[PDB]
Design a protein around this ligand. Structure first.
Ligand SMILES: [Mg+2]
Lengths: 346, 225, 158, 55
RNA sequence: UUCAUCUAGACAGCCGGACGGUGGCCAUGGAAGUCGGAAUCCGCUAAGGAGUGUGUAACAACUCACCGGCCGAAUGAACUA
């Protein structure tokens, strides 16, 4: 439950669930009733079978009903994971439909057992029990879509990394087309591709590294795109949400290299977009490939923009590269020290 | 089963082939007969653009024999039976009244790049350096080179089971392999290799060993290689 | 020295995408900013028009040229203003096509057209226009093929 | 494991003969219902494909 | 039983082809046919589907349906009891 919802028991389609419940009940219920019996025995047998079917359906539904947590209020500090993944409204509609069906099945069973209490003959009792079974079949067949959405939701949430919001953490973000996963590879151990693409990573990823005698976790942003500045896809919206609702120290990356996805054309727009969402989150900036771009010959025209950025107090730009194993360590140690200083002061 | 709109042609194709060949037999003066069986669609496009004043009409060997005459008694033109058994594979017919020497020189001198894969050949030795493979055989430098995908590795590990100059999947070999040698007869794996990258090591020309005249309408057959 | 031949497509009058052009200029080491400036200079003739840009490289020397495409030429034949609006979707130039621009759109491709004659080039262009689906000469493009076949519309040939 | 996948697909295709009789009863009816549903789906797909090809 | 193919060489298999306009148009950072929605033309043929699938992030490659060569008698599809 807490940051890990892998405990969902199992999901079957509506038709499969109906078939399973029906066959299991028909196997477990005695099937030998003769006319040479008093009406009490017949009534007892059929009441037992119908109530057992009702209880079986109720127990088959209650587990999945309780498995999914209160997504409206579970981690309001973070929230917004499965909605961002696929959707929220139709998900809640389907769950509410399942819950309504659960709240109606037992009422139908109680009403029908009350009606059949006054049964009189084998023909009429068989007919009414067949009617009850048909009502159950209809009310389980009228929810084919909710199970279909439920399967996808369960599969999506199964492979979801656990994130602890109320613990120490760090975040890495930057413009894509730079090899963002390289920091993850050089810091922690996991599986990711470093292909020369905008989307080096395709989802959120959390590390488990340990330095300064303590353990820390770093969250990688899949990427940032700000062409409309408001309307993105899941890849960018999840990153922007994580940046917004987290006070963890954030390291920002822009590629000041002649070879990149955007060259040097949109970093100013990046800074303008992030400044409203970068206020008290310990902004950190690094640059890669310094040993091959030679920052000693940087142009003053772009140095004016760098100074304009530096006008904001929380700006620090240095030279580092992932091709070595000294600059990366120094940068990470400085980030950890800044985090420690921030938490000591605050 | 089948889930496509395309269906079998039938025999109206055969009927229209008969009609077109019988009507086209009487269009120009000088018919054409050649010896070139296996070709490619770009080559057909090139030859048709060159010979637009002709007709690139061809069909089954049996139907061509039927049109030319299965017996001496029946014949569209005088001495058309010698053209029936003239060729055994696949060849077409043309009606060009341009010249003789010019067209023969065109045939003997034309050369294009393609793939042949013959049993007897004298090809250059082709090797696969290093463990990492390449799709062209390593001709361009590794700096400009590009990698490949190992998803189709079982295909080469089962059907090929040998390092390949062309059509190579990302594996590692302890030593380079000379997939091609001078004066060697290619096997199934060699025929499969040397096709992916399109590097046409083969030169295709026109080998002409056929002729026929219509005003003379008599026996004619050359042999030029 | 060595000559590199490659084909790329971009938007006229705009800087080429460095992310897409990175494999092309990877070993070359040329500046993608300079490449984008060259693309803009070469494609300034067409504004917001998707056309092909050449990248002729011989010992890493910039050389670009513009070669149009059939669909783009069909779009731009009417000379209608090309505009992109975030509030507009599924909008395209479907104005009536006169035979005056039919001759030009056949002639531009006739040099590289497989069809030997201007009639073949014109019928191929008519098939392309029927594929595109724009109105032609206040007439349905479907019937122009049979009109050509029956001689209803004559295409001058020289 | 492409050969393994192909063998699995062929075995699944040919398993209908083995599945012709299953259990001690009450399973042949389910198998018949599944076969009928598959046949109905195939007939509907064939009719739709023929209609699409026609017009 | 009905409807077909077949010496005017069928079904199975080996091998070859399956090309261009066109990466055809809206979603783009991706939609070459295959995460989607519309989408339905020719050029030259005997043949190539604005594409049934395998699946790459895309490409690519393979594969089917349709033709071609090898082998030369009867064979296919549906339905009935
Ligand atoms: Mg990366």
């Amino acid at each position: 439950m807490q940051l890990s919802w892998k405990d969902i028991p199992t999901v079957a389609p509506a038709n499969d669930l109906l078939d399973i419940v029906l066959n299991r009940t028909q196997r477990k219920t005695p099937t030998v009733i003769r006319p040479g019996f008093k009406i009490t025995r017949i009534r007892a047998f059929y009441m037992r079978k119908v109530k057992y079917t009702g209880e079986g359906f109720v127990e088959k539904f209650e587990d999945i009903l309780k498995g999914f947590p209160n997504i409206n209020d579970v981690h309001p500090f973070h929230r917004d994971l499965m909605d961002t993944l696929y959707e929220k409204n139709h998900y809640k509609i389907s769950l509410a439909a399942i819950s309504r069906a659960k709240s109606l099945v037992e009422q139908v069973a109680r009403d029908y057992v009350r009606l059949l209490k006054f049964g009189q003959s084998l023909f009429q009792c068989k007919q009414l029990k067949r009617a009850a079974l048909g009502r159950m079949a209809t009310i389980v067949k009228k929810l084919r879509d909710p199970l279909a959405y439920l399967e996808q939701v369960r599969q999506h949430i199964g492979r979801l990394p656990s994130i602890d919001p109320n613990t120490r953490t760090l975040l890495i973000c930057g413009y894509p087309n730079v090899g963002k996963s390289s920091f993850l590879r050089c810091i922690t151990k996991s599986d990711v591709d470093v292909q020369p693409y905008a989307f080096t990573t395709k989802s959120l990823y959390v590390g488990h590294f340990d330095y300064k005698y303590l353990r820390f976790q770093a969250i990688d942003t899949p990427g940032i795109l700000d062409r409309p500045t408001e309307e993105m896809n899941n890849i960018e919206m999840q990153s922007i949400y994580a940046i917004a609702h987290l006070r963890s120290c954030v390291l920002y990356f822009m590629d000041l290299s002649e070879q990149c996805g955007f060259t040097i054309e949109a970093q100013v727009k990046l800074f303008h977009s992030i400044k409203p969402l970068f206020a008290n989150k310990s902004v950190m900036v690094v640059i890669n490939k310094t040993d091959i771009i030679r920052p000693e010959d940087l142009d003053e025209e772009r140095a004016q923009l760098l100074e304009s950025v530096k006008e904001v107090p929380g700006v620090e730009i240095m030279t580092s590269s992932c091709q070595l194993e000294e600059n990366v360590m120094e940068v990470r140690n400085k980030a950890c020290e800044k985090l420690l200083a921030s938490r000591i002061e605050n | 089963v089948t889930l496509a709109q395309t269906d079998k042609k039938g025999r109206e194709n055969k009927e229209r082939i008969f009609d077109e060949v019988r009507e086209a037999l009487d269009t120009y003066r000088y018919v054409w007969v050649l010896h070139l069986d296996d070709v490619r669609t770009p080559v057909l496009q090139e030859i048709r653009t060159s010979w637009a004043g002709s007709k690139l009409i061809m069909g089954k060997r049996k139907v061509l024999q039927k049109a030319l005459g299965e017996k001496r008694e029946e014949e569209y033109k005088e001495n058309l039976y010698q053209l029936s058994k003239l060729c055994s594979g696949v060849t077409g017919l043309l009606f060009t009244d341009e010249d003789v020497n010019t067209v023969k020189e065109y045939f003997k001198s034309y050369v294009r790049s393609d793939y042949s894969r013959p049993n007897t050949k004298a090809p250059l030795t082709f090797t696969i350096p290093e463990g990492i493979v390449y799709s062209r055989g390593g001709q361009i430098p590794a700096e400009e080179d590009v990698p490949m995908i190992h998803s189709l590795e079982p295909t080469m590990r089962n059907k090929f089971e040998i390092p390949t100059k062309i059509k190579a999947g990302k594996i590692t070999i302890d030593s380079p392999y000379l997939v091609c040698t001078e004066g060697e007869k290619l096997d199934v794996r060699q025929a499969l290799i040397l096709k992916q990258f399109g590097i046409a090591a083969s030169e295709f020309k026109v080998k002409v060993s056929a002729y026929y005249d219509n005003d003379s309408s008599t026996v004619e057959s050359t042999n030029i290689n | 020295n060595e000559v590199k031949y490659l084909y790329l497509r971009a938007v006229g009058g705009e800087v080429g995408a460095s992310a897409a052009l990175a494999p092309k200029i990877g070993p070359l080491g040329l500046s993608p900013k300079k490449v984008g400036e060259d693309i803009a200079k070469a494609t300034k003739e067409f504004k917001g028009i998707k056309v092909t840009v050449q990248l002729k490289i011989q010992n890493r020397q910039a050389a670009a040229s513009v070669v149009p495409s059939a669909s783009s030429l069909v779009i731009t034949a009417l000379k209608e203003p090309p505009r992109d609006r975030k509030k507009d979707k599924n909008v395209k130039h479907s104005g009536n096509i006169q035979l005056d621009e039919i001759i030009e759109i056949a002639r531009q491709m006739r040099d590289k057209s497989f069809g030997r004659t201007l009639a073949s080039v014109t019928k191929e262009i008519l098939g392309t226009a029927q594929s595109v689906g724009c109105r032609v000469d206040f007439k349905n493009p479907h019937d122009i093929i049979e009109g050509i076949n029956a001689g209803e519309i004559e295409i001058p040939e020289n | 494991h492409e050969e393994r996948k192909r063998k699995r697909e062929a075995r699944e295709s040919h398993k209908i003969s083995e599945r012709a009789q299953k259990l001690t009863g009450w399973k042949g009816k389910q198998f018949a219902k599944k076969r009928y549903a598959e046949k109905v789906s195939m007939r509907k797909k064939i009719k739709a494909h023929e209609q699409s090809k026609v017009k």
